[PDB]
């Protein structure tokens, strides 16, 4: 399942920062909304072709990232990645946040 | 996606008002809470179906506030086929089931 | 985390949270945060050998619902004030503090 | 007790601005996260340094809804420290916490 | 134009109170939203058949009722009731709030 | 100065509950509106009465973002009144303000 | 009504970012402010028409927050005929005109 | 109302409001409210015969935008502190207070 703390990639963090400056939305709230936007599009994560590293500056607590959407987020990851282990599941979460935020255009 | 204007069944709404008598929490907030409590259990909506005769028909936004995105997403994930008249009953079934699932067995 | 994923307050407490909401805009879960901290910065302290208080509140809400952004802080205060207590007792301690904090609004 | 108004060191301010540069996270919210992350770790302040930050802010502005917890934590760890030095204990934890946030 | 202070009817006030208990929404915010809901339906106010009195308990300041939607509200009243005077215009505003809130069903 | 914690009279509390009964407006927000409506009118407190209300609330809970204005208004009108009586001046304006709100 | 996802033209967005350089106000909030300032003047949108090449495409809600209801209502009142692709340009024209109308002549 | 429907701050002030937002979440208009009141509960007082301050801020915002729910309160404070001032001077007085209140956050 999901670990106590995680980080996004730098590539993702920077886009969250731009979104922060354009809208009021804080990186954690924005990462939640981007996750939802991504999971309801065609984008799906696959381990055998992931190479991107979570080199992000901010390593927040799971509860801080996900707030009162934790259970809903863990449900979604569970349905879409039934066979991934904790280390892959973080990548999928992060890949989804990257995709969702990228889609802001 | 969910229609712009939604309503719960009369019992569910009645039970939210009961919950408001004991705590001070308002029906719309209580419903956000119940929806998510429900969703983490094993409850799934099966059309069979309740008619939506709650006294108020409110905006999607008044109902769900900042939980609107997660709410729509969970529904889309669990009931991808259901249109709009069916989705609102999916949402409504989850609220009602979550109310009993928020209840302290004392 | 030594507080569980979800917990309830007492009936006595819930009812006082409701009334504060009546007079103020303050929602029960936010008032619980405020009550906890006004209690914890005073002299009141939970102790397990003086506890005949049943947590018979109506609602078992998620920890995140109750605590919100004050979660980490709350759990750190509880750990420091109550190092020897087990989960069962930590819930009673958190609840006792919410009750004490909110009782401080009568007379 | 913690004084009504306080600043970080310039260095720790710049460290908070750095984090905002990378993420958009707000210095004062970052400072709350740092503080508790630092305390939970076993880091501790001992005299052995200069609070020359740009901004002095109301104690409530820095800490918001974490004020009580912060004040209570500081009194428990540093029951001897007087006003002047409680700021430096808080400032030290913020700085350590920022490393712990990464 | 609109006067410094006004009141709704008791009939309207009570429905705002029920909406307050059902949702978080305060009577003034709710009166704004109900105004918008009403003005975009078929309902239109007419003086020669109004008899309802604004017997409301709360006589708030215009700015309190309308907040940062004042200019938008006064634009709408202006377009829909170009010939009404202050005393009629309050009735139209109030009639619209009544209609909008009633429409919650 | 206004004390950290205060109550209305029972009577004025009930008057605030009455308003909530009719409208849903929140006693403490009603109290802020009343206060300023009363002061703007020419109503004024003179000793010549009992604050036996149910709820005692933090000064910040009553007044929120109007605290400063309220405290400044009270000092200007009643520069002589001491803590004990500033509450009764505030309570009197709230009660008068409620009549003025209707 | 307005589409779920909207964008300003590039100049308007550029001018909002300039406004952010001087004050700290964010583009979305500044746009709420500019829209209403615009609407109280005599400016009306005439299709002729700007293409919407702003760097971000955001949700209606992120853009308008609690002003969404008044915003949609004003547009419905002033441009009852315009569909959806046209409404967003109506909104966008108002933001741009309101920015100059929020500007202090110093 | 003797404050106009809309007003501007000085450039100097706007810039300090922006920086406070940088460090805190606090939006410029909310900070203006807070600055005004922290200024007005102190010793600072506007006086027209000592005023070479041009209000050259970028934005002319609505009074309601600036003041919000604090409107009535603000206007009542200004009326009591500045009974003899005309609208033109009341704006300068409100602005001077916002500047003073916000300057109090350096060193």
Mapping DSSP onto H, E and C, the string for E16-79 reads HHHHHHHCCCCHHHHHHHHHHHHHCCCCCCCHHHCCCCCCCCCCEEHHHHHHHHHHHHHHHHHH
Q: What are residue D62's DSSP bridge partners?
A: none
Q: Give, to the nearest 10 degrees, the angle between helix E86-102 and helix E27-39.
A: 90
- Out of E24, E104, E105, name the one closest to residue B26 (CB): E24
φ, ψ for residue D58, nearest 5 deg: -55, 135
Report yes or no: D65 and C33 within 8 Å, Cβ to Cβ: yes
What are the tokens at G62? 């992120």
Q: Give the integer Cα–Cα distance in Å for G55 and G70.
A: 26
What are the tokens at F84? 């004990």
Q: Give the integer Cα–Cα distance in Å for C17 and A95.
A: 42
Among candidates H15, A52, H22, which has minimal Cα distance to D18? H22
Task: Let me know if chains A and B touch, i.e. at least 3 Cβ pairs under 8 angstroms.
Answer: yes
Report how far apart, in Å, the C-alpha atoms of A26 and of each of A29, A62, D33 are.
6, 15, 14
Report yes or no: H97 and E89 within 8 Å, Cβ to Cβ: no
* Residue E21 with chain B: CB contacts under 8 Å: 20, 26
Can you tell me whether residue H60 is helix, strand or coil? coil
Tokens 């003034």 -> residue: E28
Q: Give the integer Cα–Cα distance in Å for F3 and F87.
A: 8
What's the CA angle centered on A17, arms A11 and A19, to 5 degrees? 105
- The answer for residues whose C-beta is within 8 angstroms of residue E72's C-beta and 6 or more apart is G36, G39, G70, G73, G74
CATH assignment of the domain containing E75? 1.10.1220.160
Report yes or no: E93 and E42 within 8 Å, Cβ to Cβ: no
Q: What is the DSSP string of H34-55?
A: HHHHHHHTSS----TTS-----
Q: Chains near G, with 3+ CB pairs < 8 A? A: A, B, E, H
Give E105 to chain B, closest Cα distance, Å. Answer: 6
Among candidates E58, D94, E62, which has minimal Cα distance to H5? E62
Helix or strand run (H / E) with residue A5? strand A5-6
- The answer for residues whose C-beta is within 8 angstroms of residue F15's C-beta and 6 or more apart is F95, F98
Q: What are residue G5's DSSP bridge partners?
A: G59
DSSP 8-state class, residue F6? E
* Neighbour-count burial for G13-28, b at 16+ CB within 10 Å, e otherwise: bebbeebbeebbbbbb
Q: How was this structure determined?
A: X-ray
Best mutation target among A13, A25, A27, A57 (most D Cβ atoms within 10 Å) is A57
* Residue C71 with chain A: CB contacts under 8 Å: 63
What are the tokens at G75? 């547009």
Tokens 């956050």 -> residue: H105
Q: Give the integer Cα–Cα distance in Å for E9 and E11.
A: 5
Q: What percent of the residues of chain G are helix, what percent strand, and what percent coil, each to the nearest 5?
A: 60, 5, 35
What are the helix and strand counts (H, E) for chain C?
A: 5, 2
What are the tokens at G19? 């406004």
Report yes or no: C51 and C88 within 8 Å, Cβ to Cβ: no
Q: Give the integer Cα–Cα distance in Å for C35 and C25.
A: 15
Best mutation target among E23, E60, E104 (most F Cβ atoms within 10 Å) is E60
Q: Give the integer Cα–Cα distance in Å for C87 and G16.
A: 52
What's the CA angle centered on A100, arms G10 and A32, to 5 degrees? 115
Q: Give the integer Cα–Cα distance in Å for D96 and D59.
A: 20
Report yes or no: E65 and E19 within 8 Å, Cβ to Cβ: no
DSSP 8-state class, residue G103? B
Chain breaks in chain H (C to N over 2.5 A) after: none
Identify the sign of the CA torsion F3, F4, F5, F6: positive
Contact: H25, D20; criterion CB under 8 Å? no
Q: Give the integer Cα–Cα distance in Å for F6 and F87.
A: 7
Range of the domain at F30: 2-102
Q: Chains near C, with 3+ CB pairs < 8 A? A: A, B, D, F
Phi-psi region of C10 (alpha: psi -120 to 50; beta: other; left: phi over 0): beta
- The answer for residues whose C-beta is within 8 angstroms of residue D46's C-beta and 6 or more apart is none
* Residue C70 with chain D: CB contacts under 8 Å: 65-66, 69
Report yes or no: A38 and A103 within 8 Å, Cβ to Cβ: yes
Distance of CA D48 to the CA centre of its chain: 17
Q: G68 to chain B: nearest residue by CA?
A: B61
Identify the sign of the CA torsion D48, D54, D59, D61: negative
Q: Give the integer Cα–Cα distance in Å for E5 and B101.
A: 47
Interface residue ranges in chain C relative to chain D, Cβ cutoff 8 Å: 33, 37-38, 40-41, 69-70, 72-74, 76-77, 80
Give C72 to chain A, closest Cα distance, Å. Answer: 9
Q: Give the integer Cα–Cα distance in Å for A30 and D97.
A: 23
* Burial group, residue B28, by CB count within 10 angstroms (0-12, 13-18, 19+): buried
Contact: A17, D22; criterion CB under 8 Å? yes
- The answer for residues whose C-beta is within 8 angstroms of residue B18's C-beta and 6 or more apart is none
Among candidates G37, G47, G35, which has minimal Cα distance to G92? G35
Q: Give the integer Cα–Cα distance in Å for B36 and B25.
A: 16
Helix or strand run (H / E) with residue C74? helix C71-81
Q: Give the integer Cα–Cα distance in Å for C59 and C14.
A: 9
Task: Let me know if chains A and G touch, i.e. at least 3 Cβ pairs under 8 angstroms.
Answer: yes
Q: Give the integer Cα–Cα distance in Å for H107 and H103.
A: 10
Can you tell me whether residue F79 is helix, strand or coil? coil
Q: Give the integer Cα–Cα distance in Å for D19 and A26.
A: 13
Length of chain H: 107
What are the tokens at H46? 């506007």
Tokens 């920077």 -> residue: A14
End-to-end CA distance of chain C: 36
Q: Give the integer Cα–Cα distance in Å for G55 and G49.
A: 18
Rg (chain A; Cα; Å): 13
Q: What is the DSSP string of F14-71?
A: HHHHHHHHHH---HHHHHHHHHHHHHHTT-----------SB-EEHHHHHGGGHHHHH
Give F33 to chain E, closest Cα distance, Å. Answer: 9
Q: Give the integer Cα–Cα distance in Å for F94 and F90.
A: 6
* Resolution of the structure in the document, Å: 2.5
Rg (chain D; Cα; Å): 12
Contact: C41, D71; criterion CB under 8 Å? yes
Report how far apart, in Å, the C-alpha atoms of D11 and of each of B32, C26, D50, G27 are.
44, 39, 9, 31
What are the tokens at C105? 């609004």
What are the tokens at F5? 């914690």
Among candidates H42, H98, H77, which has minimal Cα distance to F73? H77
Q: Give, to the nearest 10 degrees, the angle between helix C71-81 and helix C28-40.
A: 40
Best mutation target among G104, G105, G106 (most H Cβ atoms within 10 Å) is G104
Half-sphere exposure of residue H61: CA atoms within 13 angstroms, side-chain side? 26
Q: Give the integer Cα–Cα distance in Å for B51 and B86.
A: 11
Q: What is the DSSP string of C35-85?
A: HHHHHHTSS----TTS-------SB-EEHHHHHGGGHHHHHHHHHHH-TT-
Best mutation target among G61, G67, G72 (most B Cβ atoms within 10 Å) is G61
Q: Give the integer Cα–Cα distance in Å for A77 and A85.
A: 11
Interface residue ranges in chain C relative to chain B, Cβ cutoff 8 Å: 8, 14-15, 17-22, 27-28, 54-62, 65
Length of chain E: 105
Q: Give the integer Cα–Cα distance in Å for E16 and G103.
A: 38
- Out of C22, C25, C107, name the one closest to residue F56 (CB): C107
Tokens 């409107």 -> residue: H71
Number of domains chain C contains:
1
- Out of F16, F27, F55, name the one closest to residue C105 (CB): F55
Rg (chain E; Cα; Å): 13
Report how far apart, in Å, the C-alpha atoms of B57 and of each of B13, C85, D95, E38, G65 are.
11, 48, 52, 15, 21
Q: E29 to chain G: nearest residue by CA?
A: G66
* Residue A32 with chain B: CB contacts under 8 Å: 69-70
- The answer for residues whose C-beta is within 8 angstroms of residue D95's C-beta and 6 or more apart is D8, D9, D11, D12, D15, D34
Contact: E104, B56; criterion CB under 8 Å? yes
Report yes or no: F94 and F27 within 8 Å, Cβ to Cβ: no
Best mutation target among E61, E63, E66, E67 (most H Cβ atoms within 10 Å) is E63
Report yes or no: G95 and G63 within 8 Å, Cβ to Cβ: no
Q: Give the integer Cα–Cα distance in Å for G18 and G32.
A: 16
Contact: A58, D24; criterion CB under 8 Å? no
Helix or strand run (H / E) with residue D34? helix D27-40
Report yes or no: H58 and D61 within 8 Å, Cβ to Cβ: no
What is the SS3 assignment for chain B?
CCCCEECCCHHHHHHHHHHHHHCCCCHHHHHHHHHHHHHHCCCCCCCCCCCCCCCCCEEHHHHHHHHHHHHHHHHHHHCCCCCCCCHHHHHHHHHHHHHHHHECCC
* Neighbour-count burial for A19-57, b at 16+ CB within 10 Å, e otherwise: bbebbbbbbbbbbbbbbbbbbbeeeebeeeeeeeebebb
Helix or strand run (H / E) with residue A37? helix A27-39
* Residue E63 with chain H: CB contacts under 8 Å: 64, 71-72
Tokens 């981007």 -> residue: A34
What are the tokens at H55? 């209000």
Q: What are residue C61's DSSP bridge partners?
A: C7
For H15, other C-beta atoms within 10 Å of its C-beta total 16
Best mutation target among F18, F24, F33 (most E Cβ atoms within 10 Å) is F24
Q: What are residue B19's DSSP bridge partners?
A: none
- The answer for residues whose C-beta is within 8 angstroms of residue B17's C-beta and 6 or more apart is B27
Q: Give the integer Cα–Cα distance in Å for H38 and D4.
A: 13
* Residue H105 with chain D: CB contacts under 8 Å: 55-57
For E95, other C-beta atoms within 10 Å of its C-beta total 22
Q: What are residue C38's DSSP bridge partners?
A: none
Half-sphere exposure of residue F83: CA atoms within 13 angstroms, side-chain side? 5
Report yes or no: D93 and D85 within 8 Å, Cβ to Cβ: no
Contact: H105, D55; criterion CB under 8 Å? yes
Helix or strand run (H / E) with residue H62? strand H61-62
Q: How many residue pairs bridge chain E and chain H with CB atoms within 8 Å of each other?
A: 9
Q: Give the integer Cα–Cα distance in Å for D57 and H72.
A: 27
Tokens 């500047």 -> residue: H99
Q: Give the integer Cα–Cα distance in Å for G94 and G79.
A: 12
What's the CA angle centered on D12, arms D7 and D14, to 5 degrees? 105
What are the tokens at A38? 């991504």
Report yes or no: H1 and H86 within 8 Å, Cβ to Cβ: no
Can you tell me whether residue G51 is helix, strand or coil? coil
Q: Give the integer Cα–Cα distance in Å for B37 and B40.
A: 6
Q: A68 to chain C: nearest residue by CA?
A: C64
* Burial group, residue G74, by CB count within 10 angstroms (0-12, 13-18, 19+): buried
* Residue E75 with chain G: CB contacts under 8 Å: 39-40, 74, 77
Task: Let me know if chains G and E touch, i.e. at least 3 Cβ pairs under 8 angstroms.
Answer: yes
- The answer for residues whose C-beta is within 8 angstroms of residue E1's C-beta and 6 or more apart is E74, E86, E89
* Residue H73 with chain F: CB contacts under 8 Å: 36, 66, 69-70
Contact: A16, D23; criterion CB under 8 Å? yes
Q: Give the integer Cα–Cα distance in Å for H77 and H72.
A: 9
């Amino acid at each position: 399942m999901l670990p106590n703390r995680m980080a996004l990639s730098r590539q993702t963090e920077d886009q969250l920062k731009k979104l922060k400056g354009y809208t009021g939305i804080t990186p954690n709230i924005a990462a939640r909304l981007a996750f939802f936007r991504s999971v309801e599009s065609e984008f799906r994560y696959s381990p055998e072709r992931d190479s991107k590293k979570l080199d992000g500056t901010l390593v927040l607590d799971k509860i801080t990232w996900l707030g009162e959407t934790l259970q809903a987020t863990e449900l979604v990851l569970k349905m879409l990645y039934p066979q991934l282990e904790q280390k892959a599941l973080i990548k999928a979460w992060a890949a989804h946040v990257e995709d969702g935020i990228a889609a802001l255009r």
